[PDB]
Each structure stands twice: as structure tokens, then as C-alpha cells.
Write a protein that binds this DNA or RNA. Structure first.
Ligand SMILES: [Zn+2]
Length: 56
RNA sequence: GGCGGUACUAGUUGAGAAACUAGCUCUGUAUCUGGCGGACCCGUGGUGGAACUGUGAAGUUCGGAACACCCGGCCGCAACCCUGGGAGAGGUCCCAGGGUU
């Protein structure tokens, strides 16, 4: 056949870290003990307090 | 907890407002990159072979494999982006594909 495909191009370099994330660390608060999916910061309803006004 | 703006409160300085510091109020804030489940398909991917020999390590024989738990991809999902097309009084739209999580 000859002539089908070819290039052979070098391209490397993928060194990146996640704040030295640990298998026992949190990727949210950076706290060690729980996981991000278990971060106590994870907000969620219902809502806390409730506003209310009258004549103003 | 920390800081900034606000006012006030205290202390100091000062004649002076004002300056500074501290206290604090409110106000506001700032982070899920390792993705999570699902099924159970593929790779012996990872790790602990089993007994036996032996003071000890190490081996040996067995099987030459098995199992188990995890593992990756993989699928379902949402997020982000690359890519394109065409018209539109200037970058609007709509929609599909992939990768990664
Ligand atoms: Zn956390």
C-alpha cells in the first residue's frame, strides 16, 4: 500500500498534584480524617434561619 | 478561627478634633482536583499462593492453577472544555461527538 499514516511526534510532561491530597484527606477543607464527599462543609437544605419584616 | 468595611465600646496620645491600638458588631466572605454508584464483561491489573522441608533465612513439593479483597477500564450520571456548521448590524444561538472527572 505504502503511504497510510505516520508522524511519530514526541510530547510528554504531565506532573501535577492536588495539594498533596492524601487517601485519608479532604479535598475540600484539606482536613485529614474524612473525604471531600464526606466534608462537613458540604452545604444542603433545608435552610437555616428565616428573615421577616413588618412595616418599613 | 482570620480578615476587610461600618459604627460603637475601651485604652493611650492629645488642648483639639483627630491618630493609633485593642475589643467587637454586623456585613460579607472564601474550598468537593482522589468523582460516586452499576453491572460483573475483559486484563491474572494489584496485592495475601497452599501445604511441606528447615535452628534460620530460603527453599521444596504441590498447583504451575485455584480463591479472596481491592483494582482499572467499562457503563449511568452532572460539571468543564475542544470541534463544527450556518444566519446574525459584532461574537448571539442551537444542537450533536469526545476526552477527563
Ligand atoms: Zn472536609
Amino acid at each position: 500500500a505504502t503511504v497510510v499514516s505516520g508522524q511519530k511526534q514526541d510530547r510528554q510532561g504531565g506532573e501535577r498534584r492536588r495539594s498533596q491530597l492524601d487517601r485519608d484527606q479532604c479535598a475540600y477543607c484539606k482536613e485529614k480524617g474524612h473525604w471531600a464527599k464526606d466534608c462537613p462543609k458540604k452545604p444542603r437544605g433545608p435552610r437555616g434561619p428565616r428573615p421577616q419584616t413588618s412595616l418599613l
